[PDB]
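Report of the visiting student (M.T.), summer placement. My assignment was to run the structure pipeline on a short list of targets and document each run. The first record concerns calmodulin.
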Amino acid sequence: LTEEQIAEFKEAFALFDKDGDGTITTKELGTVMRSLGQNPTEAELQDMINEVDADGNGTIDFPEFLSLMARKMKEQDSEEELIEAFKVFDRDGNGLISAAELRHVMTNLGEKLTDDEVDEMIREADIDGDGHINYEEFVRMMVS
Ligand SMILES: [Ca+2]
Ligand SMILES: [Ca+2]
Ligand SMILES: [Ca+2]
Ligand SMILES: [Ca+2]
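After the run finished, the structure tokens were exported:
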């Protein structure tokens, strides 16, 4: 949108575009993944380009990288938000929300819930049947 934001995205496009032609190819994408210790085969390189390549020419140009980056940054916010919210519920930092933790946070939000009502709410969200809410079960409830 602003000139500074465009500048910063051009700098990120530039580490992927190794030869400076304005396009990122499966081989340039590959050179980047290899430098980060991952060595993909030409097949999953192709799947990665296909996701971002909107005109079908087999490469990625700057408009197409800009759309990807922008969409990816809205998604990464939605995650940051859901991780923060889970972490306020998991008072002891063990990865699981228990009935006591949820009840304690609900009373601080203004809602005094009995053990039967809190148990109903855990039972609804619990998929693996341990009577706790893990992160997966939490995001799945934050939609559904
Ligand atoms: Ca290139
Ligand atoms: Ca393209
Ligand atoms: Ca916990
Ligand atoms: Ca569970």
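Residues 24 and 61 are 6 Å apart (CA to CA). Residues 62-89 form the longest helix (28 residues). I thank the supervising group for their guidance throughout the placement.
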